[PDB]
Structure formats: C-alpha cells, structure tokens
C-alpha cells in the first residue's frame, strides 16, 4: 500500500479500536480501483484466533445493498417493475391497505410505516401473511421514509418470484457468482465455520439468530476481500460483463426519494459529493437514521450520479459494518468489526480516510 494510505488508515483506525474496545477489525481501502487490506485483533478472543483477510463478519443491514442490486437485476431482466403492485407478486395479500403499495415503496421504506423488525413470533410464510395482512399504515404510501427490515425484506422476497428461484439461490446465481464473491454467504457452510468470527456483545460471544426475511434484510456474512470486490463492482459497473447485473448495480444507485440532503437508492443511500461530514456523521445516529422522515419523490428517478457519497451501515448483536464509496474518485472503504459500536464513529472514521485520499 502507498504510504499515504497506510498513514491515514493507521492514524484513524488505531484510536477508533482503542476508543470503542473493538476486539477484531478488517478494513479495505479501494484506491484508484485497487484494494488495500488491514487487519487487527481477534476473530475469537478466548481461542486467540486473529482476524485475517478470510475472516467472515456479519454484515447486518449492509446486506440490503445485495438485495437492492438483486432487485435491480430483476428489473433489468424485465421480470419486475418498481411500479408493480405488491399484490401482483403476493395475491394472497388481500387486505385493503395494500392497494397502492408498490414494489418501489417496499424497496425504499416508504410503504407507510412498516416496522423496523419483522416480529420474532413470525416464522412461517403463514405467519408472515398474517403479519402483513394485519399491519395498519400510519401514513399514505410514498410520504414518509421509516427504515424497516420488514419493508425491504418483503421487496427482496417478492422480487425473485418471477425467476422461480429462492432468494438465496437467486442471490448466489445472479450476484455472488458473477462477481466471484466465493466467500460471501447467506448460510455459512459447515466447512467455513472456522473462518466465521464471533461477535462480541457485552463481552459475550454471539452470532445473529435466524429470523423471517433475515437473508433479505440483514443476514449476509462476508470477508474483507469479497467486500472490497463488492465495492469495486458498485464503483465501476461498466466492467461487469453480465449486462443485467451491470444495469442492476446502476439502478440501485438511482435516486428514488429525497429527504433532507440524502437520497434513497435500492439498499444504498447517497448524498452529493462533496458532503458535509456532520450531516452524514450525525445522520447515521439511530436517533435520525431510524426516525420517520418526510420524503419528496424524484420522478423519474435520477440516474446514478458519479459525484456521490454512496454508503450503508449495518449491525447485528455482535458486529458493526460500514461501506462507503465515491464513484467519481474511484475510491471506497469497507470497515468490518466484531463489535456493534456506534454508527457516527464509523462514518467519521471513513470520511476522515476517504477525504484524505481524494
Ligand atoms: C441492520 O443492520 N439493522 C436494521 C437497522 N439498520 O440501521 S443501521 O444501518 O442504522 O444500523 C437497525 C440495526 C440492524 C438490526 N438490529 O436489525
């Protein structure tokens, strides 16, 4: 790595790890299109297993970027349209509040108040039907953004229905395999458990529990190498040979709604670059990021803007992840940690690194 990259990374990440008491961490900087890797600490504290470039971290809600791109690929294949009604893909969803709720609304958290989580009690498709049939919206569709695993989770499950594939099989065949993400998993194979870091919550080793729509909203595990490749693919989709996947990557960075200075993509969120760092840092705090916010539609959606800060946070009980990139600058960062530490500290560190390298 160029000394300027080593310098800024060690100057930024070393005190972050000390301040947040992070047990293990992996970072990739993508600089002029090439990846540079850094690792610290332990994937398993008690067993003294170091983090390596093959360590699997739980991505939590960063998984939604894969879901958004898979949905964009289905659009590009002609299999779905974002204007399609939800009920086109789930005709059993008959309750009257679903009239007018489209795939766009599900994908972008604008259906009208779908809740942050699918309830833990919901486990089968019959439970899931009852949940969505009994849900009562707080707002008309397309008026308020309320970040929700139950919203984009349902989008992902329905987006793959025309293909005839399960969500997991669609993701493997249409996204992971073409991009050579050979160590990215919705379900970690038995033979890969030795590479799966433990997460740490209040000092206790933990892994994410199964839940309905987990794969779609928060369930992917990946290595720092595969995540660097994922950033490269989203930075420069023109190098992707599979045309519908290239197009799906582009569509996930289209701007569908604006609230404040942020724009909602498919999974990804975007702001115009240069950003105000306080806006992205403070906006990442759960107090703002999980709050309902009024949206303005963008009709037609703005095609992906190269001079954007494109990013996504994610957490599980034991992990904290962050990805951010600037297509115009060919510049990106992935930060994976096996402790869920506050979002603003992730965003502040990422901006400090990328701003120094721009
Ligand atoms: C994703 O990691 N999740 C859903 C939601 N994401 O917001 S975050 O990206 O600002 O963390 C809350 C955290 C997490 C979850 N517990 O489901």
From TrEMBL:
<dbReference type="Pfam" id="PF00144">
    <property type="entry name" value="Beta-lactamase"/>
</dbReference>
<protein>
    <recommendedName>
        <fullName>Beta-lactamase</fullName>
        <ecNumber>3.5.2.6</ecNumber>
    </recommendedName>
</protein>
<dbReference type="InterPro" id="IPR001466">
    <property type="entry name" value="Beta-lactam-related"/>
</dbReference>
<dbReference type="InterPro" id="IPR012338">
    <property type="entry name" value="Beta-lactam/transpept-like"/>
</dbReference>
<dbReference type="GO" id="GO:0030288">
    <property type="term" value="C:outer membrane-bounded periplasmic space"/>
</dbReference>
<dbReference type="GO" id="GO:0017001">
    <property type="term" value="P:antibiotic catabolic process"/>
</dbReference>
<dbReference type="GO" id="GO:0046677">
    <property type="term" value="P:response to antibiotic"/>
</dbReference>
<keyword id="KW-0732">Signal</keyword>
<dbReference type="InterPro" id="IPR058136">
    <property type="entry name" value="AmpC"/>
</dbReference>
<keyword id="KW-0046">Antibiotic resistance</keyword>
<dbReference type="InterPro" id="IPR001586">
    <property type="entry name" value="Beta-lactam_class-C_AS"/>
</dbReference>
<dbReference type="InterPro" id="IPR058140">
    <property type="entry name" value="AmpC_escherichia-type"/>
</dbReference>
<comment type="similarity">
    <text>Belongs to the class-C beta-lactamase family.</text>
</comment>
<keyword id="KW-0378">Hydrolase</keyword>
<dbReference type="GO" id="GO:0008800">
    <property type="term" value="F:beta-lactamase activity"/>
</dbReference>
<dbReference type="InterPro" id="IPR050491">
    <property type="entry name" value="AmpC-like"/>
</dbReference>
């Amino acid at each position: 790595a160029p000394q300027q990259i080593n310098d800024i990374v060690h100057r930024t990440i070393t005190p972050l790890i000390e301040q947040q008491k992070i047990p293990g961490m992996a970072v990739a900087v993508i600089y002029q299109g090439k990846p540079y890797y850094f690792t610290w600490g332990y994937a398993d504290i008690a067993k003294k297993q170091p983090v390596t470039q093959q360590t699997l971290f739980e991505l939590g809600s960063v998984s939604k970027t894969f879901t958004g791109v898979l949905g964009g690929d289905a659009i590009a294949r002609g299999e779905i349209k974002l204007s399609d009604p939800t009920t086109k893909y789930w005709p059993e969803l008959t309750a009257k509040q679903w009239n007018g709720i489209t795939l766009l609304h599900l994908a972008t958290y604008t259906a009208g108040g779908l809740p942050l989580q699918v309830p833990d009690e919901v486990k089968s498709s019959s439970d899931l039907l009852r949940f969505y049939q009994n849900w009562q919206p707080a707002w008309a569709p397309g008026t308020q953004r309320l970040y929700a695993n139950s919203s984009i989770g349902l989008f992902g499950a329905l987006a793959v229905k025309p293909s005839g594939l399960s969500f997991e099989q669609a993701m493997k065949t249409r996204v992971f395999q073409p991009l050579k993400l050979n160590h990215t998993w919705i379900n970690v194979p038995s033979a890969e458990e030795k590479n799966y870091a433990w997460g740490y919550r209040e000092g206790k080793a933990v892994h994410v529990s199964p839940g309905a729509l987990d794969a779609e909203a928060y369930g992917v595990k990946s290595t720092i190498e595969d995540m660097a490749r994922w950033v490269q693919s989203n930075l420069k989709p023109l190098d992707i040979n599979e045309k519908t996947l290239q197009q799906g990557i582009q569509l996930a960075q289209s701007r569908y709604w604006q609230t404040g200075d942020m724009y909602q993509g498919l999974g990804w969120e975007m702001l115009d670059w240069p950003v105000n760092p306080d806006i992205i840092i403070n906006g990442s705090d759960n107090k703002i990021a999980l709050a309902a916010r009024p949206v303005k539609p963008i009709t037609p959606p703005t095609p992906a803007v190269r001079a954007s800060w494109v990013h996504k946070t994610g957490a599980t009980g034991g992990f904290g992840s962050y990805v951010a990139f600037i297509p115009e600058k060919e510049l990106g960062i992935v930060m994976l940690a096996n402790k869920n530490y506050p979002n603003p500290a992730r965003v502040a560190a990422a901006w400090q690194i990328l701003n120094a390298l721009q």
